[PDB]
Amino acid sequence: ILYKTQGAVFIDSNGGAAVNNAYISRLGNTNGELEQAVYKPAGFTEVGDVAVTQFAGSEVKFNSPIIEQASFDFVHAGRDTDSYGLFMVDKPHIESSGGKKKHSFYLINTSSNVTLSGVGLSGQDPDLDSMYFLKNCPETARNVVRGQMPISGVKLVRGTGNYPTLVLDCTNMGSQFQFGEVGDIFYIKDVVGVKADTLYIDPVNGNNYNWGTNGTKPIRELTNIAKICQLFRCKSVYLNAGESVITSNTELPMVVFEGPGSLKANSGSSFLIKAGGTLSLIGLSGISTDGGHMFRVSTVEKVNIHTNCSVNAGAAYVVLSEVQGNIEYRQLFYSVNCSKYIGATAGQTIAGIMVKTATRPTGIDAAPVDGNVSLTYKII
Amino acid sequence: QPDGSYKLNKDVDYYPTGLDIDNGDAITCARKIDINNLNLITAPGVKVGVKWIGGAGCTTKGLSIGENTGSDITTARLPRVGLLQSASWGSIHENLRILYKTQGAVFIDSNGGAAVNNAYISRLGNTNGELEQAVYKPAGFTEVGDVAVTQFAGSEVKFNSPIIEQASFDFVHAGRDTDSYGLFMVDKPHIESSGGKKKHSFYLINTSSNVTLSGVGLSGQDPDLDSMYFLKNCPETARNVVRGQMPISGVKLVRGTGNYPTLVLDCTNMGSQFQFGEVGDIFYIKDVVGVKADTLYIDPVNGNNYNWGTNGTKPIRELTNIAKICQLFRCKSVYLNAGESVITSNTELPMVVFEGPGSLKANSGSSFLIKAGGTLSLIGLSGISTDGGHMFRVSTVEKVNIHTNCSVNAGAAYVVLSEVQGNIEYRQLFYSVNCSKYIGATAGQTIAGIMVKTATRPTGIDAAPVDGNVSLTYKIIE
Ligand SMILES: OC[C@H]1O[C@@H](O)[C@H](O)[C@@H](O)[C@@H]1O
Ligand SMILES: OC[C@H]1O[C@@H](O)[C@H](O)[C@@H](O)[C@@H]1O
Ligand SMILES: OC[C@H]1O[C@@H](O)[C@H](O)[C@@H](O)[C@@H]1O
């Protein structure tokens, strides 16, 4: 199919239908971005030509399609009532002259299973273009990506709605961490078979579009560092120079934090510890808050907090347990300031404490914790 | 031409590249061509059967090349190279049948979106197939032997359900030299070869791949060299993904060259391969998803490093990759068969239960390495000792538990040395223990708990069981 506005459009009942080795292309992409789709689902209001459009419960199987010069390669909407109609594309060969493109898979209220074949790209707009756009996909939907990402860097995903649904199923990412961008990390639900050892943060020169798992492309904010570390099984977080700050309670992954940066909790916020393990701050320029307790522990599992940097909770505590916890805190050298090292909201929390520094509040040596904490050992 | 005109290619070896099509150096005149059941036979010795060059969007169904003349292949009416294709993006070969002598089909350069479905490619018998020298191939492929399907220079043809028979090499694929572009894609290949003669099924050079196995396959008769996969110089960023079902009979999975592992087992159904097959070279496996084994077996006397090691009847021989192997298959324990399992350089031990009659020895001043949190347990072994180095070098800041219920001898060294600001709990249960200090550290304070429950211990350190860089949380001795 050689078309001007829309290549092929599949609507309503098409059970079991198949489209094999389709070769669908606009006759060039000149002014393609100005075409207006004629037959489309109401949820699709973007301007731009669309090679393949599907909606109202249609679930045609697209096997090895070849799509060229399109603003949108695929626009698919699940059925309005229950999100029925799986978007199925196996190994699409996507290309466009000059790299002009808006999105490859614009998915509305739907699930999908796509296998990439190492061919593709994302548009020239550094803010809006992305391989995937997930619009209002429900909580129970999953948009599964298998196969090989394109060789050149692309922006993987953007979206609207409250639920993440993108799944990297053993996806071969190539050098995307180094040369590409995730786009909006919020939309990724889970990741299988893809790891990275370190997440890089740079509050001055970082970019939130980046994956953050490669040193030359660090992200900028702390907002999603726990999620990213959980997805890629990161073992460390590297803080580039400057102050990495939070203004709302934010979770910190239980990993090793390193680098010249510092951590700061503003607006009375606290850093959150929601998982067992060991949180280590090694060699940072310091961690402090402007009034909130430093670490709010919400897990009953063994939590180890290892701070080898300057620590200043001011009048507040270093650790506050919101459950009946089990905590081991060790401060190594540098300095520490707080009213109590560990406290708890209620019915007894067990804790172990080691403070190895002359620069500490000597006054609480004999009474290091509040009444709700019972010590297993105290080494000061 | 030099004068600016154009001449029809009449050269047997010529094939146009994507570059040529853009340079104006080549202009294709192959379009709107459709083939249905064309049978092509050739006199013995003819070089190429079909030159499918520049045939973008051209299609084929039931194209059949070569004649099954008789048992002797040197006199059979089939060509040395069945089909050679380039600059054919969007071309589809449906149910292509090839009887060849040297090479079945060859795909080079631009072939974007091209597909070869249900191809039936076979050498006419495998007699002297290993002596066949490939004619059109990537520079990186220097091996001798017939090749059913060859692909290089960025060609990324989709191969769906091909049936490949009697080939030395079923597939030889090389990614583009500059950026490793060109995914090797094969869905459910039905590979067979009389008398199990074969060198490799997938010889992959500087490339990524996605292969789905259908429970059909085998590896050659050579116990050292033959393997299903051979990964030659695949880049760090590449992934060679294996899905589906492994062959029923044992095979050797992988061998390679290069410094980076790229093979991925994605929920692969291994059947009884741990018991009857071999991994070959564990180094090349990058990661494993959905495949677990409870125990890793080591036998310094009767073990074979080619083995998976996860089945009792097929243990591995050395300790070099036990950490790697345990991480891949989530092993809960390691069983040491009778004999001394030794290391001559720093080697990591997974945080699992070690059991069996074997012993552990660190020679040449080496140390066992603890890089992960958890509990390392040595239960009932013949003992663990070193010839001078510290026994356990801890480099993780996570909670480390060391449970020794066997004889322990670190001589003049420590049982545990924390190279970081550690958090360790050590417990010696019965047997005997010898060391200068039970736990020590290189610098800035390490917290530790210790229990030594045995009369045969260095009694002179009951009062000072650890060095000055370690602070105790509890101490249970006597
Ligand atoms: O773009 C930001 C990055 O630039 C790199 O050159 C530096 O090595 C990083 O420290 C920094 O985060
Ligand atoms: O890192 C970001 C993540 O932080 C977690 O503590 C929240 O529970 C998640 O909703 C969020 O995605
Ligand atoms: O067991 C083998 C593994 O041991 C680890 O300690 C090393 O970091 C890896 O390089 C190696 O593959």
Nearest chain A residue to B421, by CA = A332
- Residue A91 near residue A117, CB atoms below 8 Å: yes
Q: Calculate how far, in angstroms, residue A236's C-alpha sits from the geometric centre of ligand 3.
A: 18
Q: Which amino acid would we find at residue A195?
A: K
| Structure token pair of residue B311 | 């089945």
Q: Is the CB of B318 under 6 A from ligand 3?
A: no
Which candidate from A21, A93, A115 shows the least CB-CB separation from B112?
A: A93
CATH superfamily entry for domain B1-292: Single-stranded right-handed beta-helix, Pectin lyase-like (2.160.20.10)
CB contact under 8 Å between A304 and B185, yes or no, is no
Distance CA B391, CA B360 (A): 10
DSSP calls for B180-247: ----EEEES-EEE-GGG--SEEEEEES--EEEEEES-----S-TTT-EEEEEES--TT--EEEEEE--
| Structure token pair of residue B102 | 């040297």
Domain boundaries, chain B: 1-292, 293-478
Q: Is the CB of B321 under 6 A from ligand 3?
A: yes
- Cβ pairs A/B, distance under 8 A: 105
Measured in angstroms, the resolution is 2.0
The length of chain A is: 380
Distance CA B410, CA B392 (A): 9
Closest ligand 3 atom to residue B323 Cα is: 1
Closest ligand 1 atom to residue A218 Cα is: 12
Distance CA B171, CA B217 (A): 13
- Residue B372 near residue B397, CB atoms below 8 Å: no
Distance CA A173, CA B286 (A): 14
| Structure token pair of residue B183 | 């995914």
Closest ligand 2 atom to residue A230 Cα is: 1
- Residue A128 near residue A158, CB atoms below 8 Å: yes
Distance CA B62, CA B35 (A): 8
- Residue B225 near residue B247, CB atoms below 8 Å: no
Nearest chain B residue to A352, by CA = B473
Experimental technique, in short, is X-ray
Residue nearest to atom 10 of ligand 3 (CA): B324
| Structure token pair of residue A240 | 């580039």
- Residue A359 near residue A365, CB atoms below 8 Å: no
Residue nearest to atom 8 of ligand 3 (CA): B348
Three-state SS string across B314-365, please? ECECCCCCHHHHHHHHCCCEEEECCCEEEECCCEECCCCEEECCCEEEECCC
Closest ligand 3 atom to residue B327 Cα is: 1
What are the angstrom distances between the C-alpha of A321 and each of A227, A255, B195, B234, B447?
22, 19, 68, 49, 22
CATH architecture of the region A196-380: 3 Solenoid (2.160)
Pick the CATH number of B293-478 from 2.160.20.130, 3.90.700.10, 3.40.50.720, 3.30.9.10: 2.160.20.130
Beta strands in A64-125 (DSSP E): 66-68, 72-77, 87-90, 93-95, 103-108, 112-117
Q: For residue B418, how far is the Cα from the chain centroid?
A: 34
Q: Is the CB of A240 under 6 A from ligand 1?
A: yes
What are the angstrom distances between the C-alpha of A40 and each of A37, A77, A174, B44?
6, 9, 34, 59
Which candidate from A170, A174, A278 shows the least CB-CB separation from B266?
A: A170
Q: Is the CB of A164 under 6 A from ligand 1?
A: no
The answer to whether the B1-292 and B293-478 domains have the same CATH topology is yes
Is the CA virtual torsion B10, B11, B13, B15 positive or negative? negative
CB contact under 8 Å between A354 and B447, yes or no, is yes
3-state secondary structure of A60: coil
Q: For residue A378, how far is the Cα from the chain centroid?
A: 39
CB contact under 8 Å between A23 and B185, yes or no, is no
- Residue B116 near residue B138, CB atoms below 8 Å: no
Which candidate from A23, A148, A192 shows the least CB-CB separation from B210?
A: A148
Q: Calculate how far, in angstroms, residue A228's C-alpha sits from the geometric centre of ligand 2.
A: 9
Which residues make Cβ contacts (< 8 Å) with residue A36, sequence separation at least 6? A5, A47
Q: Is the CB of A207 under 6 A from ligand 1?
A: no
Q: Calculate how far, in angstroms, residue A214's C-alpha sits from the geometric centre of ligand 1.
A: 10
Please tell me the distance in Å from A170's CA to the nearest CA on chain B.
7
Residue nearest to atom 11 of ligand 3 (CA): B324
Which candidate from B90, B264, B397 shows the least CB-CB separation from A280?
A: B397
Interface residues from chain B to A (CB-CB < 8 Å): 57, 89-90, 92, 112-113, 115, 156, 158, 179-183, 185, 208, 210, 237-239, 241, 264, 266, 287, 289, 373, 397-399, 421, 423, 444-445, 447, 471, 473-474
What are the angstrom distances between the C-alpha of B371 and each of B115, B293, B349, B392?
47, 22, 8, 10
Per CB-CB distance under 8 Å, the chain B contacts of A333 are 444
Per CB-CB distance under 8 Å, the chain A contacts of B444 are 308, 332-333, 356
Q: Calculate how far, in angstroms, residue A224's C-alpha sits from the geometric centre of ligand 2.
A: 6
